[PDB]
Amino acid sequence: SIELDKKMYKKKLKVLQYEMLNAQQFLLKNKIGLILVFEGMDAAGKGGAIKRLIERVDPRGYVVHPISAPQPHELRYNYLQRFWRKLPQHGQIAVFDRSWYGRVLVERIEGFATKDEWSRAYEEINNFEKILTAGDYIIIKFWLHVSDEEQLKRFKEREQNPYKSWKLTDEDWRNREKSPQYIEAANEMFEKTDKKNAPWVLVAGNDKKYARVQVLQETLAHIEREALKRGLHLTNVLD
Ligand SMILES: Cc1cn([C@H]2C[C@H](O)[C@@H](COP(=O)(O)O)O2)c(=O)[nH]c1=O
């Protein structure tokens, strides 16, 4: 595939979003749930890619969960409990903007999880996801990669953006210094939890338009593959 100008990007995006709406109706009709994980550094473009992914999908059929730090009430349970509570029904879509993989990313880097906790978490997470995918759930995980210089450009845009500058803090700037550790943790995560039933898709995120298109294409492709594995064929169930 090639990069496209804005008009052709818009047309390709519109077709892919129609196909995503159709795929949602297909998964609902066949009562197969869909779980999408998004991870990546601050300003990697997770939020915008999610917005394009579900923009034309029926709002009754999905929930986007913006995941932040566990609250004190959530820490009274196992770290996966707050995520168990958010799982979609069969036939519904759940999007996790950050996810249980925080156990092996920010919580590992910041020392919130002990060494034993994050060390054993890879197989705990594999086993959890396998429970779901052996039943009636499809899981895809996306890592949006962004360069340090592109992230810096986006931080400066945010600090000049009246809708976003209130949220950018000195702590975020300082956390940019921890990026090497995050990259190492993400690479170990990829090595240990990239599974056939629950793949990691690495998304080239420096160009937002390409990232949005790729997220849509990869979601649709894995839905079609998993449909085939289940003896079903994705067709147009809209018209
Ligand atoms: C998303 C997330 C953040 N955190 C921590 C990191 C920071 O100390 C704090 C706020 O992070 P945030 O500003 O990126 O949401 O919460 C966790 O411990 N676990 C998580 O899953």
Side-chain angles (χ1 to χ4, degrees):
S1 292
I2 60 167
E3 187 198 358
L4 271 28
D5 71 358
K6 194 181 173 184
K7 293 186 173 176
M8 228 57 52
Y9 158 82
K10 193 174 178 181
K11 286 151 123 63
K12 186 164 190 181
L13 178 70
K14 285 166 177 196
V15 176
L16 290 169
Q17 292 170 324
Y18 173 81
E19 288 176 42
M20 188 63 209
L21 164 62
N22 180 76
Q24 179 226 35
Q25 292 301 303
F26 176 81
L27 294 172
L28 181 66
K29 177 184 190 171
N30 287 281
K31 306 179 175 186
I32 296 166
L34 176 67
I35 296 161
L36 307 173
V37 164
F38 288 80
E39 300 286 356
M41 297 192 307
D42 201 1
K46 300 182 298 292
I50 292 167
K51 285 194 284 193
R52 274 72 185 187
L53 175 62
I54 46 70
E55 177 182 358
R56 318 274 183 184
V57 169
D58 190 341
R60 298 172 304 176
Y62 72 90
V63 183
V64 172
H65 301 281
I67 296 301
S68 46
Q71 294 288 110
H73 69 275
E74 297 171 319
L75 295 166
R76 298 180 190 126
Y77 300 89
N78 180 267
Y79 74 103
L80 291 175
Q81 185 86 40
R82 68 201 280 243
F83 297 107
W84 291 336
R85 182 173 149 76
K86 291 173 177 58
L87 291 171
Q89 302 183 2
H90 298 152
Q92 298 287 304
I93 301 172
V95 181
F96 292 92
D97 187 348
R98 305 179 81 171
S99 70
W100 42 97
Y101 285 95
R103 186 80 152 178
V104 301
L105 297 173
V106 61
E107 297 176 17
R108 167 190 172 175
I109 268 71
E110 292 298 308
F112 300 156
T114 66
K115 187 175 187 186
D116 174 68
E117 281 173 339
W118 66 257
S119 289
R120 71 175 195 252
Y122 305 104
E123 295 310 326
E124 294 177 337
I125 288 164
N126 286 333
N127 297 340
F128 162 54
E129 290 178 3
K130 184 84 173 180
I131 287 174
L132 298 181
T133 61
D136 290 330
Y137 288 98
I138 291 163
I139 292 176
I140 321 167
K141 297 114 60 162
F142 294 100
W143 173 268
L144 273 71
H145 168 78
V146 70
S147 66
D148 294 323
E149 293 197 345
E150 176 69 21
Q151 186 194 51
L152 175 60
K153 181 183 175 217
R154 299 179 187 186
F155 272 31
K156 288 201 174 187
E157 286 165 0
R158 283 182 183 187
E159 85 172 359
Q160 295 301 126
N161 186 327
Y163 300 110
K164 301 159 172 181
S165 67
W166 66 278
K167 194 177 173 183
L168 181 60
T169 72
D170 293 312
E171 185 180 341
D172 305 312
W173 292 101
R174 294 192 315 257
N175 278 3
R176 280 178 46 80
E177 198 194 353
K178 294 163 179 171
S179 293
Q181 308 155 54
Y182 273 93
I183 299 308
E184 170 181 82
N187 282 121
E188 185 171 354
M189 173 180 74
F190 302 149
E191 298 177 47
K192 296 188 177 171
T193 64
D194 183 16
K195 299 300 181 183
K196 178 177 186 177
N197 53 288
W200 275 107
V201 178
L202 272 60
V203 174
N206 286 328
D207 176 53
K208 288 183 180 186
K209 295 182 191 306
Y210 174 98
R212 300 157 184 170
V213 162
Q214 180 185 3
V215 166
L216 272 157
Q217 287 176 342
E218 287 282 358
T219 302
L220 291 166
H222 288 82
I223 287 175
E224 292 178 47
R225 292 187 199 106
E226 292 297 331
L228 259 53
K229 283 182 201 173
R230 283 173 167 80
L232 308 170
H233 296 75
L234 178 60
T235 72
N236 191 312
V237 299
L238 299 176
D239 67 1

